[model samples]
Each structure stands twice: as structure tokens, then as C-alpha cells.
Target: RFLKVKNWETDVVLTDTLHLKSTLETGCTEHICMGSIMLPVRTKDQLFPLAKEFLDQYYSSIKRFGSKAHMDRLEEVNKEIESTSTYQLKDTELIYGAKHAWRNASRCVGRIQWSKLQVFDARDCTTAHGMFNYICNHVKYATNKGNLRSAITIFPQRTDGKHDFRVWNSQLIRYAGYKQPDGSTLGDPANVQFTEICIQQGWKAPRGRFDVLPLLLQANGNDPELFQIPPELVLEVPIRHPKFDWFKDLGLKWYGLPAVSNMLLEIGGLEFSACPFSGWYMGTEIGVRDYCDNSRYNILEEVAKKMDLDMRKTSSLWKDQALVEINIAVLYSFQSDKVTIVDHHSATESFIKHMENEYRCRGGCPADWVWIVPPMSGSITPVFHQEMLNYRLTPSFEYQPDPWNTHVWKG
Candidate 1:
């Protein structure tokens, strides 16, 4: 008597343009999943006031029309809600919905492994301290001592307009940015303002250039609190190149897992604002963007100078050349430490295979070409040539506002 929601990720790989016909079939296996039943989503129930209108909007977002099992599940869920005046999603539903959120993420290029996400159910956590404890556990588990795993821990849902729970940091692991006297930054420039706020709230600010920021959490309208991450629980990789022993002298490092916390998880019209999720690294995420972006470390010029490149001329590809080495060092260091990471070339191919399998299983892919295309060597990859569609897919993780800035609440 349970409703099984089928996996719709795999279909046929079809491109939006003719130039993509030459893309090779990668035989991707990212769509694998276990079976499950879900609570029924009711439409016109003559039940809870305005419930039909709510269910209609929710179903439209999930796009669950025409599936007999889906409708049947909704019926059952409606019955449960009417009888108990309470609604809940089964474990399978939460896991399936979380994975789909990744697949539908417009900016992620690694959705090929979406089905492999680990889900931690933490709806039982009712206090801000309890939420912080669960987040630390997620960081430790996802860190995996350098061998990172893709994971997510979900908190309670927003039912009947109760105050929503939330995580404040963009990610569970991040380098603090401290502003210096000369207008330059000692650490992550992007996080300077948030880091300042953290300090003001009694969290000890490490003056180091790469101190991992702690978890800032809020629960049921309570004020946010800062919880420093355990240093040993965090798996950090020292950025060192295979050929350049001096690269270690740069004193650069990053956490093994990229656990994003400042995102709202939407499932069946219910939003869990405190769900934190993570995926393994694609090397360029650190090398090209995190380390080299203008607001970040901005290390391209220094790196070029270190390599003794002719900085006087742009024709020498100084920026491009230096960037390659940085990217290489990131790849080498993570792999040498037995950590999970991906290169642009490999990630591009995986994305292609993922697309093809998605076409074979779901339908045409709904992808953002700009994001699907890797940062480096854009023209060389199969995804670069393929045109894609960008449409809203629900049961998704969406960018949400920072909790401190969201309302009048102080940290």
C-alpha cells in the first residue's frame, strides 16, 4: 500500500543542436537507485483549507502528473494528514528528493553521481545546539579523512508557518577572510564581512589566512550561535605540486569536502531551510576560482612571478600558464592524499555520459551550458558544443539568503 516514486533521471541523450551529434556515448552509470514508496500528494481534497490550491502548485513543481503510483501515493498522504493532522515524508522520499535536487541544480557539473548522495535525517533536532551538533557530524563524516563522500543532512520542515530553522554559512568548510590595514586581505577576501560578524559575536577569529569558519546556526526563531568546527574533524589538503616542493611554502590548503550549508531544500511544497549538503571536489573549483578569483586569493600574478614568466606581455599567456600549474598542483595534492577530486577533462566526460544516460532515462537534459562547460578548455569538451535547456525543476536545493541578513536577527 506504499507509493513508489520512480527514478526519472535516465532517458535518452539528445542535444538541442546539430553540432552535438558528434558527441560520443559515454555509457554512464550514474542513474542507479534503490526502489521506494512515497506519501500521496493530494490536489482537491475538500480537506485542509486551501489545501487543493497548495497541492496543485506543489505537484506542478514536482511535475508528477500522469504517474498512477504518484497519484496513488498522494491519496495515501492525504489520508494520513487528514487522520492525524500531521504530514511527513518517508525516508526514501527524503533521500530521493535530495538526490534529485542535485540533479536539477543548474550550476553543478557533477550531477552524474547525484543518486549516490548520503542522506542524514535530522528532523528530530529541535534546538540550535542540537542542529549545530548534527552539522559538525556531517562535516566529520563528509570529510572522511581526505576521502570525501557526497552527503546531506536534512532538518525539520516548515509546517503551518512556524519559524524556519537555518544554517548561516555558505558552506560548512570555508576559509575566513580577515581585512588588513593596507586594504589587502590576509585570508579569504570574499568572507571578510561575514568573518567580521562572526568575531563580533564572540567566535574567536583565527588570524591565519586559511582558518576554517565554524557553523552558524538558528532554530525556531532563536538567535544564531557560532560553533567552531573541531580542527581534527576537518580534513585539509596541503597544496603542493609534484615537481615544485616550494609550492608548499605558499602555505595554501583547503578542506577535502565542499559542504554547502546556505541553501533551502524544497520537497513537496515543504521547505527545510537548514539542510547542509556536500559533493566531492572538481580541482578547478579550488585552483581556478577559489584560489584565483579576484575577490579571493588573487594569486595569478604572484604565481606568474614565481614561475619567472614574462609578466610584461599578455601574449606569453602568463595568466593561462600559471593557472594550469595551480590546477595541476591541486589535482596532484588531493590525489596524493587519497582524496576524492576530479579534473576538468574527466568531469566533462562524466557530464557528457551523464547527459546521454539522462537522455536515455529521463528525456532531454535541462542544463545550463555556461555551468555545464568547464572553466578551463571550454571549446575542447563535448559539453561545450552541446546546446542545453534551462528550466525550473522542483524538489530542488535553492540559494537562500544568509540568516543574519535575512531578518533583524543578530548573530
Candidate 2:
């Protein structure tokens, strides 16, 4: 009959964490499985002597406990060992004791092994930070085509509102001169075009800026070839047939909530153009749909109320009386708060301080005007104010959090 191990004995003692004991047990199992035939015995004369020597060492190791109870147990199992023409001293008690001894020995060695582990130094911290910084700053924002880039620069600042005192500026440096089909580096000097620049006071947190960057960049018309406004302001309605369902089963996909609402506006003739630009065209279909369906300002309802236009009337255009280009800016600041895996907060603070000092030393103003897409409802204060208070030392900053504030200039 097979013996069953107790749940408590197996659960607490025989976990995978017993790595050293497991290694030793595996070695012993492999050695026994090879049997005497695979042993490195040079001659027939030496075979029996070598086998006796191995048995002596094995028996001596077991006898080191020196208990009468153990010897009696071993003697009783000796009959089974000789009958099987192999070591028959493999009783349950002996096996259990051997495994327990291995675990104890491993515990001593493991403590020393863990103590030898090295701690991270300044060089290691810098290297890790450099990798993350490179990924976040260079790889993620390498292009000027996508709307997601805008959110990277804008969202955290608008959400945190901690560093509104400093200016926010982003530039696109264009490489000049390339032979049409020839491989030559000879070209014009790279010219830098400032994309978005702004300065304000009192910022907050939890807002999304990276998500909106691509839209702002595209609206500037910096590169028409890379990004194009949608062909039609609204999604094309599927033709009604026996196979198509307008509400339940359409092939249409919305990018996000904002995209959904924007699409609805276009379909309702409420947008500026039939082929209106969906901020970042790449993945904005869903946003347009969601925004149109659930946004505070329902595009269809707003159009109906303001223009007195009927949805069934296909030719009517809906217009808003207060249409103005949205150009808002936000900023954020970070400070040394706590030490984690070395002095990460100190390093970050030092980097930002260095940038600020260099700018001031060069006689550059710390403030600049940047054009950004305001939040959907034109309000940033109530949303991010409390978060800003937690980070800023003083709350006397005059800038209003609303993107639609009169301070925002058109030109």
C-alpha cells in the first residue's frame, strides 16, 4: 500500500523554496538509478572492493546518529536490501531523516549566500534611470505624427498642477538636405520649430496630457503629409439592407469617447466641416463615438437646440455662435519626496534644477506662450485644484485653471 503524507507536513515543509535539498535529492536519485554496472570499476578484481568501499561510506554516514533505535531499524531493513540484490536500507524513516538533514544544511548555507548579495550604488541607479528616461523621452516621443505625443507633454501637468510656475516648451528639430536618390550626408543645417510653448501658474494632477498631444500637433498643420484630416467629418452610415443592423450590428468602430462624440457632431452637421479633423486620426474613431454618445454637450441635441435643425433634414447646417480656436497651456513640477532604492527623488530634482539654472543663466525667460487643446468642458480648476495644493508650497499663483479663461490669446 502507498503511504500518504500529511497535508500539514507536505504544505509547510516541502515547498519549492527548498532548492538546495531538492538538488541533493535529485543527485542521490540519479546515482542509485545507474546501479553497479555503470560504476567506474577498471577491472573485475576491483569491482567487489569498490562496491564494498561505497557501502562503507554510505553506512558510516547513516550510523553517525548513533541511536540504538536507528541501528535496529536499519538491521530489520537489511533483509529487504540483500533479497533485492540492492541496498534495502531505504526505509521511510531513514529517507525522511535524510531529507530533513539536507534541509537544515541548506538553511545554514543559504543565509550566507543571501548575505553576499550586493546592494545597488549610484552608478547602477544612474544607468537604470538613463534607460527609462531614454525610453520615455526619445523612443516614445520620436515622431511628430501621432496625437498621443501631445498628451505626454500636457496631461501630467494638467492633472498634477504642481509646477505651473515654470514654462512649457516643446520643439521639433528638422534635419535638412538629402540627395533625392544618392547616399550623402551633405545637407542644410537642422532647423528647430517650436511646436507648443506656454507659461502659467498653479497646476494640478490626475489629468491626461499625453492622450491629447497628437491632436494639438496635427491642428498646427506642421506636417500635412504625415497626418490628414478625415475624408468625411462623420462616419459613413451603412446602407440599410436585410443583412445590416444600424444599432445592433454595424461595422463601425469608435476609437474613444471623444472620437465618438466628434463623429456624432459631423453626422449631425454640427461640426465646422464635413471632413472635420479628429485630433489624432490613428486611433480616435472610438473616442469620437463615445464622446458623441455620452458627452456633456450632446452634439446632436446641442445642434438641434441651437440651430433648430431636424436630423431628418439632410441639408441643414448646425453652427455655434461662440466658436473659437482652443489654445491652452499647463505645467507641472516635481520635488524630492522620499528615498527609494537609493536617492531617486534627489536625482530627478537635480536634473530639473540643472535645466532651470541653465535656462536662466542664458538670460532666457522662464515663461513662454504655448498653444494647447483645452479640456473638453473648458474647465481645469475644479478638476485638478486639490491635487495641486498637495504639491505646491504656496497657492498665491494667479493663473486660472480653466483653458477657456480670457487670458488665453488667439494670436
Candidate 3:
């Protein structure tokens, strides 16, 4: 069966089919590319082919293609799917697929560390309580008390396109944004609606600028439950400049872990809706976007004022100079506290190396140039000028619609 899908990124329409090895929509057209947007759903009929393709890829990766064990495993998978309309992945396959998904993450400039990820399998979890425990454990393991490690904790896959296990927060650790009575936002403004939902569910807000939002976990299609992350498990670094002691007085801080909680993991044809993955942050992610973006912290003007830059003239490049100092403070703070963080230059350099490795091994590397380039420095980065082709690959992580908008709540 064929379906027509639109790429929300490039505004291009692409055709997708059920039987292709790359069953997921290309998210690109002949004329333009649309990269890393949420895609449409799949049916049971498409599952077996995807399973077969991934199995073949897995066997090939292990140098066992057409081997007896590989053939036997295929037979077992086929029989199981025939009986139940879906099949489960072996733990080895699950781990391998998760790593492969990370490797194929086109948007991540840190793909050089993809193979080093620790996969924590929690597919057997059947309750929100168990999920919370698994997540806390994941946090402890990934945070590593500041020397952050790359990790992913996989929850159960959807059963018959229902009973989905979902992590409702976009990131494992994000600040609660409360909409104040005066119509201003306190904390990360991106999270205001999510905070409101948490409040509606009986969670009391302390209303701090960097209050960590509780995890809204939905297990087996149940109404989401709120679980506050233990404070000790969350490692945070206070922003301080090496040259200026006054920068520490700004009271700015950020968490050590960058665990994304809401993206769906697709391995073969199976979708694990709540696999939260973490990697160390790029300094610019915190410094440029989280701190300076008008939508988030909006501290550029204040920072510039502290530096005594000419705010009256755009040609004076006040914002640019302020950005450099803020980014320096982020990197300096993380380095001083023994936390793992990368400057955008170093991160992009490593990404260029990884891109070469991917091309030499596979003839083609899937990448979204827009995402690969750092937000702070464009032309100065190697990947800024490099041309890339964006396409969907199996054993991938994908953006999914928010569970709150899709869930049917119980009274």
C-alpha cells in the first residue's frame, strides 16, 4: 500500500510504501529535503517485512548472514508473528538496534559516541512505579555524578497499536514553566503547558526558575502518573566564568544529563514509545539556546550590560560578544565541576570525522545539515558548508505526537 506524506521541515511531499526496506517516509522530495520531523504510523502488514529487513541487517553486521542460526531465528520470528501479529526482539537484537538508532541519529553532532551507549532494558515493566524506578536508575547511571554517560532505557512497545508506554516529558530533566498571574512565564517557557498539566494532576509547584519538572509516566495505556526525580540523582553545574567572579552571582545553572524522554524508538518494525536517551551536552546548547534564546532565558541584554557593551548599536555586536562569554562560562563551569560538556567547535570537528567514517563504511551517510551545524557558529564549523542528504533509516529514533494530546483519560 502507498501513502502520501508531507515533510513539515522542507514543506515537501513524499510518497511512502509498505514493502520498501526503508518503510518510513523519506521526509524529502526530489527538489528539497525535509529532515527529522514526526512521521505517520504503520500497520501490521508492514511489520513482517521490516522485521525481515532489520534481521538481515543485524545478521550482516554480525557476519552471520545466511548462517544456520540466522535462518533459525528468522523462522522463529516468522512463526511468532504468524501466531500473534507481532514478535519480540531478543535482548541482543534490542541492544544492537538501540545503538544503531543512535548511530543513525542525523541531528546529533555527537554520533561519534553512539556505540558507547549503555542500553537499560525495562520492557518487562508493567506499572508506572516500576517505570519510575527504572528511570531513576537510568538517571543515576547516565549522570555518573557529573561525568555524564550516554544511555537509553527502553520501555515496552505498543501492543496491537494500543497499551503504549510513554514518557510524557520532552526531556528527562527540564524546568517547570509556570504561567504567572501577570502573564509572564517563570522558568523554561517551553514547558508552561506541560507544567499546567502537572498542576492539573495535583502536583504543587514551588515556582522556582529552574524547578525540575516531575516525570509524567503512562504505562500500558493508563492515565499518566507523576514521579518527581530524586534531587540527588540530578547532577547540576552552577554557571561561573573563569575570569569574572561576578558571573557566578547570576544564579544560572543547568543539569548534567540531556536525556530526551519523548522520542519513539523504531527497531525493525517495533515502536518503543518511551525509550529515553541521554548524552552529554554541547556547550552551545545550554549557552546559546537555553540561555540566550529570547524564548528561554533571555539573558543576552543583561549579560551584555554586565560586560559594558554598547547596547545602543547593533554594529557594536553586543549580542555576539555576550554570547561568547556566556558560552565560555558554560564550558568553564562544566569543566571546573568535572562535568562532561563539549564546545561546539570540538563537537563539530568530531562530527566531521564521524561523517567520514560513515561514508567510508556505508557509501552514504544520512544527515540533516541544518541540525548538524551549531546554532552559535555557522561558517566557522566544518559541517556548515558540507552537503548532506536526509533520509529515514530503520533502527531510528523519531519524534512522536505528545501523549497528552493523544491519550484518552479515565475518570
What would the TM-scores of all predictions be? Answer: 0.82, 0.16, 0.92
Off by over 4 Å in 2: 1-214, 217-251, 256-400, 408-410
Which number leads on TM-score?
Answer: 3
* Cα lDDT computed for each candidate against the true fold: 0.75, 0.21, 0.86
Q: Which candidate has the top score in lDDT?
A: 3
Candidate 1 regions with alpha-carbon error over 4 angstroms: 1-73, 79-86, 160-162
Instruction: Write candidate 1's Cα lDDT for 226-302 as tens digits.
Output: 89878888888899988877788888888888888888887655678889899898998999999888888988988
lDDT, candidate 2, 258-346, per-residue tens: 21111101000011100111112211111222223332112334424433445554454332211110000000000011101112222
Tens digit of per-residue lDDT, candidate 3, span 14-121: 333322334457756778655555352466687788899999999999999999999999999888888887889999999999999988777788998888989999
Each model's RMSD to truth, in Å? 9.4, 32.0, 5.5
Compared to the true structure, candidate 3 yields what TM-score?
A: 0.92
Q: Rank the candidates by lDDT, best first.
A: 3, 1, 2
What is the TM-score ranking, best to worst?
Answer: 3, 1, 2
